[PDB]
Design a protein around this ligand. Structure first.
Ligand code: SF4
Ligand code: SF4
Ligand code: FCO
Ligand SMILES: [Fe+2]
Ligand SMILES: [S]
Ligand SMILES: [S]
Lengths: 283, 482
């Protein structure tokens, strides 16, 4: 991009998130996060990093939303809790009225070009929706569907996602929109999503079938301690066999490590994370 | 002038969901209420699980500080399981976690706090903002702030590469478990950690510590406000040997001008003004209970109200540096003299009033970052390439344990009780819980609520100092509520 090029507006709303999906994005190597913010998107609302605050920040988002009705991208980080009339997640206050996450998604959801559900919480419910929870934590696509909101959703899961999955999905979409316009472009994006709403360039390959320890798995050579890096990690709890992500190739944090080399995969991109991937440390 | 009541929701350039409401009378804050508006309930989600799962689940309390929760969790599990962490694993854990102190403090000063003092470029998310934002820096110093904000984006990313070298990835490390650390450091990966560390060291020494004092010297009024209770807590962190009795930050309490020992049995969590069932009020964490009551009258937060022997205390870099009183950095000593006319050798030489202040908390965080450099350098000398870092303990049927550490924002403990080989109770008492909590059952304010008293608001239409004070404490409301 350039400092003077076309950059679509983005609002980033946090529901029941941990801010890890924002932090992971800050770790993008290429393009750098500075280049993303100054050359790729216009991040108009984001509570962790924006200059203004409070009702003034909410009203800024609402002014941009009106100007770009149907055309802004809405990122959701975290699940949407529906119990107690939305009171388990209040995201702001304007005009002496509290705004729950439920309220915010009903307000902005219908008017976004697309909703990017970033992270497993937003995509699938994640840890806030897991056994023992009591907030009605709900995935974005289910919440929107239950409320009759037809805006396209793209899931970019992981706990957290790799920055390349987030930036790369944005770039996918912007390439498709540049070739086909907004509706045609979003239709091309939807065509490359799997049955769990995930872009196949990043989630179309299985961890285990591409794992460098697969020969040890097939030989039955299993590490008995985490620090044995020769054997397969299956007995230590590795969930690679059930996980669709490209971590084996892309690795993490500038390529310096990844979960299977260091310890085990916990299946963090999968719709049943965490409960269907637990216990983490046995098969 | 009379009263104006100002509500700020969301407070931005913090982590998580916070509303602040202040009463201003005659140009000063005279009352305050902080509300943590989002709840997840990790303490109930954890019940029934294999205890080893906790050291993954708990990290998702916060994406900024997951290594802190990882550390407290594995320490609690180590104790409950009777796991004897090998010496080299203790050091490896310190290298994983210490690297995120560098990341978090740099993130906080530049990417969260600096816009309080620095005008960013004329594009979102740096505009729009308050028309009278009280941005006092010369064109040159403002540009230095912007340039360093941009450089710091790379530096904080490098810090996460350091975490991931032995931690697997970041956010959310895989490399700390009950029994130690999952990956033995190799000679080659220690070279890689050290090469990155050198770059972070140079930025901290040459850019970050100097800019905090230099900006502070243009906002000297900000050392005169934000004192609150002038009361602090440290529970200890970064063990320096295998005895459990020696740590980089040693424990202590400071209140009403007096140093006192830290006794964790004196912690109680009150809920009168929190959205939890009234019958759970006043419990020590070993008997803690988490029963949400989002409709309870009079309550205003999902943060419980922790009190230490009845005292409302703050936590974080100021707290740790005040309790431990280390020597100041060379550049801090020099800039205190040159820019402030202050002769100081150790941290307490700033004096209680200036240390416990809005700007004093930014200074403490920069000084602590410099202090952490020497600790990491020491661990890079002490670590032994190739030496095993983990034991593999069996899960006990019945046990309890508590892990105590210091997250970048302050004191953190996790308590676990195991029954039938599963989590029976898990209770978390975190850093921003100590700072950003509401009133207790007696009506005594939380630490930040009290630190807001006296904050100047000369322009109710541009009340910038309210959130400036809050940001000095580096709030993380995901941690505060969990
Ligand atoms: S179980 Fe895990 S370590 Fe073993 S081959 Fe499969 S993905 Fe690799
Ligand atoms: S290796 Fe597994 S746990 Fe790690 S990021 Fe990839 S999918 Fe998630
Ligand atoms: N640092 C950090 Fe997170 C908070 N507050 C914890 O504990
Ligand atoms: Fe708690
Ligand atoms: S951390
Ligand atoms: S945090």
């Amino acid at each position: 991009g350039t400092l003077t090029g076309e950059r679509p507006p983005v609002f980033w709303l946090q529901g029941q998130g941990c801010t890890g999906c924002s932090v992971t994005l800050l770790n993008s190597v290429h393009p750098s996060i500075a280049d993303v913010l100054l050359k790729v998107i216009s991040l108009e609302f984001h509570p962790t990093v924006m200059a203004w605050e409070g009702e003034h920040a909410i009203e800024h988002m609402r002014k941009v939303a009106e100007k770009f009705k149907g055309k802004f991208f809405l990122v959701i980080e975290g699940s949407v809790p529906v119990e107690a009339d939305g009171k388990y997640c209040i995201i702001g206050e304007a005009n002496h009225h509290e705004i729950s996450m439920v309220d915010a998604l009903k307000e902005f959801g219908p008017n976004a070009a697309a909703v990017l559900a970033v992270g497993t919480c937003a995509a699938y419910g994640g840890i806030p929706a897991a056994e023992g929870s009591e907030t009605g934590a709900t995935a974005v696509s289910k919440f929107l569907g239950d409320n009759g909101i037809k805006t396209p959703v793209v899931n970019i899961p992981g706990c957290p996602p790799h920055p390349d999955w987030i930036v790369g999905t944005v770039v996918l979409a912007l390439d498709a929109i540049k070739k086909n316009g907004l509706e045609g472009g979003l239709a091309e994006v939807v065509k490359v999503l799997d049955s769990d709403g995930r872009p196949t360039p990043f989630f179309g390959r299985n961890i285990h079938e591409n794992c460098p320890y697969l020969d040890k798995y097939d030989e039955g050579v299993m590490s008995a301690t985490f620090t044995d890096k020769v054997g397969c990690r299956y007995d230590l709890g590795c969930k690679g066999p059930m996980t669709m992500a490209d971590c084996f190739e892309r690795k993490w944090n500038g390529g310096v490590n990844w979960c299977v080399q260091n310890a085990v995969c916990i299946g963090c991109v999968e719709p049943d994370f965490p409960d269907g991937k637990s216990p983490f440390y046995q098969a | 002038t009379g009263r104006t009541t100002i509500a700020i929701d969301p407070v931005t350039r913090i982590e998580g969901h916070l509303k602040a409401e202040v009463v201003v009378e005659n140009g000063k804050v005279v009352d305050a209420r902080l509300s943590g508006g989002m709840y997840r309930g990790f303490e109930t989600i954890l019940r029934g699980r294999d205890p080893r799962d906790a050291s993954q689940i708990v990290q998702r309390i916060c994406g900024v500080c997951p290594t802190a929760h990882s550390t407290a969790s594995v320490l609690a599990l180590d104790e409950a399981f009777g796991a004897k962490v090998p010496n080299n694993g203790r050091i490896t854990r310190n290298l994983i976690f210490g690297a995120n102190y560098l990341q978090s403090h740099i993130l906080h000063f530049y990417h969260l706090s600096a816009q309080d003092f620095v005008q960013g470029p004329d594009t979102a998310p740096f505009v729009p903002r308050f028309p009278k934002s009280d941005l006092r820096l010369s064109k040159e110093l403002n540009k230095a702030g912007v340039d360093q904000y941009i450089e710091a984006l790379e530096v904080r990313r490098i810090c996460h590469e350091m975490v991931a070298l032995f931690g697997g990835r970041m956010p959310h490390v895989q490399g700390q478990v009950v029994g130690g650390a999952t990956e033995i450091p190799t000679k080659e990966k220690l070279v890689e950690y050290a090469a990155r560390f050198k770059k972070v060291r140079d930025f901290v020494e040459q850019k970050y510590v100097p800019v905090v004092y230099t900006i502070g010297s243009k906002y000297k009024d900000m050392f005169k406000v934000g004192q609150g209770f002038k009361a602090a807590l440290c529970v200890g962190a970064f063990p320096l040997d295998n005895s459990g009795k020696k740590h980089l930050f040693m424990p202590g309490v400071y209140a009403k001008g007096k140093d006192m020992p830290f006794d964790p049995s004196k912690i109680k969590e009150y809920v009168k003004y929190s959205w939890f069932a009234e019958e759970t009020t006043g419990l020590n964490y070993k008997e803690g209970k988490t029963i949400p009551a989002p409709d309870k009258a009079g309550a205003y937060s999902f943060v419980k109200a922790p009190r230490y022997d009845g005292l409302s205390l703050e936590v974080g870099p100021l707290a740790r540096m005040w309790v431990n009183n280390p020597e100041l950095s060379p550049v801090g000593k020099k800039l205190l003299k040159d820019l402030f006319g202050i002769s100081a050798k150790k941290f307490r030489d700033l004096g209680e009033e200036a240390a416990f202040s809005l700007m004093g908390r930014h200074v403490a965080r920069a000084e602590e970052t410099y202090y952490m450099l020497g600790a990491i350098e020491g661990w890079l000398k002490e670590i032994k390439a190739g030496e095993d870092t983990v034991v593999m303990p069996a899960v006990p049927a019945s046990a309890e344990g508590t892990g105590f550490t210091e997250a970048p924002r302050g004191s953190l403990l996790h308590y676990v009780k195991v029954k039938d080989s599963k989590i029976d109770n898990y209770q978390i008492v975190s850093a921003s819980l100590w700072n950003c909590n509401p009133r207790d059952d007696m009506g005594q304010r939380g630490a930040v609520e009290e630190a807001l008293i006296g904050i100047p608001v000369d322009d109710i239409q541009n009340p910038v100092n309210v959130a400036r004070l809050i940001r000095a404490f580096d709030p993380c409301l995901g941690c505060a509520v969990h």
